[PDB]
Amino acid sequence: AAQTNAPWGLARISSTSPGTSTYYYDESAGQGSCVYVIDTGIEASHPEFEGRAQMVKTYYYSSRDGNGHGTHCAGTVGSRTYGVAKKTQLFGVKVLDDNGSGQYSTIIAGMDFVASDKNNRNCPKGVVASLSLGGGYSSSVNSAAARLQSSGVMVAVAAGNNNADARNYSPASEPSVCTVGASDRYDRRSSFSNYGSVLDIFGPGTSILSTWIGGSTRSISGTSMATPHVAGLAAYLMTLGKTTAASACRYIADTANKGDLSNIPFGTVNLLAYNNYQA
């Protein structure tokens, strides 16, 4: 129902005004849904996941998250203290090394793995892919995200932290997915956050408290941290029966807090992820 002194980002997507500390959410909490965190992997043994995280694939020497990125974003997606969808099932897809840098061919293979792996998983409510990465433009990277999107995964992707138009970044520039920009605690666009027309929605992405490796917690910033909020939100909304995978992105845009964000350039949408929860 409510999470007192939640991280500011969870409290944000649950209210129209900034500055709040409580996260209001339906009891569903993303149950019956699944989110594929495609990043540095997940420390599944973090007790904040309560066994609901599991590595399903890696592209490196081991499955462990030696970085922290993936378990952070997995935590924002669905840790029960730092998660939007606190009851969602999380799958780890390690396409990024422990240094946080993988090849496009690896990221692409990860996206097509998920597009088929979901078929041997139970997700009666729907399937999300939080894709907290990005690089320069690539039609094939863009193609893999679109393939993942058309396969029936609601794909959320970060706009990138270059403070530029996201049109030059992939899979940020793939139109069919959900290109998420980063906001800050005071309803400003994050200083690093990319923008542009391809952006669909903005997520809390500055100073985001979430799980870390080693059983720790950490506060980090980036559009990489904003897309878990949206992917969690989509996993939350999908469970509630509000939207499908192929329609959740434009659903979150229609029900977003509109016009609240400052420093939004003309042409970029002024929408902010919002669960519109009535208690």
Side-chain angles (χ1 to χ4, degrees), residues 190-214:
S190 309
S191 74
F192 46 79
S193 183
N194 281 350
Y195 51 87
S197 181
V198 70
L199 285 106
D200 293 287
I201 187 53
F202 272 79
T206 297
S207 300
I208 298 288
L209 187 74
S210 179
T211 39
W212 207 249
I213 55 176

Side-chain angles (χ1 to χ4, degrees), residues 34-48:
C34 317
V35 183
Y36 285 77
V37 188
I38 312 200
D39 208 319
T40 60
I42 311 175
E43 181 130 298
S45 86
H46 199 301
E48 258 294 317

Side-chain angles (χ1 to χ4, degrees), residues 125 154 234 238 241-249 251:
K125 286 298 142 63
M154 189 274 173
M238 254 164 270
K242 304 292 181 262
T243 181
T244 87
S247 87
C249 184
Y251 180 89

